[PDB]
Amino acid sequence: ATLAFILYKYFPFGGLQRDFMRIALECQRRGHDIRVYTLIWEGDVPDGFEVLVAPVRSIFNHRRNEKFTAWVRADLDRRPVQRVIGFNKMPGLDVYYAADACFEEKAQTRQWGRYRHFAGYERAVFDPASKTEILMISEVQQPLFVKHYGTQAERFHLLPPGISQDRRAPANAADVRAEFRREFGLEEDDLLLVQIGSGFKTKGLDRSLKALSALPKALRRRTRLIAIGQDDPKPFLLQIAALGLNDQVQILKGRSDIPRFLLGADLLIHPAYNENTGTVLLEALVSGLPVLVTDVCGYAHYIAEADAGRVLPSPFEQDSLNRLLAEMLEDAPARAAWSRNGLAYADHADLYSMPQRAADLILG
Amino acid sequence: MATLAFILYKYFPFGGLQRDFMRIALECQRRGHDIRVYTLIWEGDVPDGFEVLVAPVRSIFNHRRNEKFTAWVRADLDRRPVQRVIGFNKMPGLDVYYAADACFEEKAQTRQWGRYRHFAGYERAVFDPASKTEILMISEVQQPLFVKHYGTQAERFHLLPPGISQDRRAPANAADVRAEFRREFGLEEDDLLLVQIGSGFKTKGLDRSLKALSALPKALRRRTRLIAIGQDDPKPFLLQIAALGLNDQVQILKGRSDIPRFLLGADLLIHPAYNENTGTVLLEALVSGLPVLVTDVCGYAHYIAEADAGRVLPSPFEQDSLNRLLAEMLEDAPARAAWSRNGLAYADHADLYSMPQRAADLILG
């Protein structure tokens, strides 16, 4: 009856990790024991989950991961399960949840060990002779996987989103908003930008900050940014110092009260360099928080489609971002429309049901 | 605060009160309200975002445990305020009461005992003209009994339509679910399955059903079996089954979640209750096209009459009239096919589903 779930890292504050957790909980609800193999588990263990932290070690993450596989398989050979579900690419998965973009594609934007390892493990899932079922959440990547490996179409299953319910604006949103802004010292005429999620460099924190720096006087004195993620802030503190933004930027470690931030803020800014999907984009949306996002993000189309913010087309130019941010912030009418647009869309679209649909496919 | 407090003595997945509560609560949640629950026990899964508080109060007498419960709850509430308080049992401090029970005071004629005084006192707590509790009704029949005993103001009552879940309706593959089920339990084409569904076997008349299975003509009795489904102890009934010789044709099962399989696999729902506020499973049979044999005391029995989806036995109850009726309904396969068809058609035209949305509408203003 047991399901073995594999991922390299569990922590509470990542997209891959919250997806794994919500799927796993649902399979358990459905009457399954839950085994989990991992290199690290931070935060609570739900009741009934057997969590196996692997004792393997290397000065190279790529080799560490190869050892991890052999370790896992050695345990699984001795203790069989019904099905093996992996959230990272490696051999021996029955199902793969594609929480990462296509590696081989990204590479081309040879001889090195890291390249051959990560490409080797991708092919391990996506090769035509592999029997791994693939759970897709970014539509855009499927054709890239097929271009590079020729994976069969029958093997792919596109899931809708799995935003948790707590992210949806509550009936007392105005009260949550006022309490939050009272707490952080934000007045009616202050503007809060929030940049949410770990991976500050990849999600374009540097771009956000330049764009804050380049706002016209009247908007600049009114604007502050809070970034929320596990990353080392120190590489950005130097940027923040250079640009004179000490008094109007803060960077916080990961935390579980993201919905309060979503309600208290005036804009989600997310000018990612690259992103498989971007759960927070939609989390902003169901909170009624306008989004500024680049078009490379897999979930960007939802912002354009619900008219709940602006999507900045490629190629990225700092100058365009600057302009777009200033214009979204000058336009209080536009912002009100995008909040209401987001909330209404949240009431239509299936943005929630990914875990049940993911459970269906794993279980049959 | 947007929190709604929901109060019920017992949550478990396999009761009418409990399922109505779950569905109202999920609807209110989906409209942006966090859900807190006060209860003496909670069995089964806990939906995402639901704060369940299991009260630590204890007494030898249920009625006194209940009074300690109320005090425990009010203490939590006064320290942690909510938007609105909705109860599924009658007690003080309710903004809203959902009447999953019949009128007690009326049933107490069917003075000094502490049990009586408590339940009467908690019912008056809701229904008195000075209480402000709004009442959500599901059995229309009880509203005048309440006004008779308490003088409750008309405007405080709001009659809701039924709240049958979508999954009880015969689906597209009904015949395949039916055939699969009857294969599993070993039922041939000429076998006839009576089902009796709900915890509370005594009140729901399992003794009467059993007598009636026993009194069938040899030829039918040979072909007929009964499955009862609920949480009760089977022990008292296993003496009756034996004493009537019914060992090899009666099974009693614990609460389960696959009730629709049974409704599709059965040949008759039998439900000769002594009393019953409404009776959800009566409409579940109906929307599965399972014909029903029901006493007229059940508040949903009329739906069986109005839809011609089975027969209703008039009060006063007489065992031998039940016997006659069961025999008649089983003997007549064309009438049973007609009651089935009648059930499915009535389900396609009637408002049997929208209770949770209407209840939420009244709770939220």
Ligand SMILES: CC(=O)N[C@H]1[C@@H](OP(=O)(O)OP(=O)(O)OC[C@H]2O[C@@H](n3ccc(=O)[nH]c3=O)[C@H](O)[C@@H]2O)O[C@H](CO)[C@H](O)[C@@H]1O
């Ligand atoms: C005796 C009595 O006064 N009962 C009341 C109580 O329902 P009861 O639980 O007494 O009976 P009911 O037939 O109204 O409700 C049973 C419900 O539980 C379900 N079920 C039952 C058995 C099982 O194994 N699995 C399962 O899911 C069944 O399919 C239905 O959805 O509350 C109802 C709704 O609030 C009405 O007020 C009923 O009149």
Ligand SMILES: O=c1ccn([C@@H]2O[C@H](COP(=O)(O)OP(=O)(O)O)[C@@H](O)[C@H]2O)c(=O)[nH]1
């Ligand atoms: O401090 C934090 C940062 C992020 N998150 C959640 O982590 C997920 C991040 O997923 P996303 O797709 O935005 O980014 P990824 O981590 O996959 O790059 C979302 O549910 C965020 O709300 C969180 O709970 N706390």
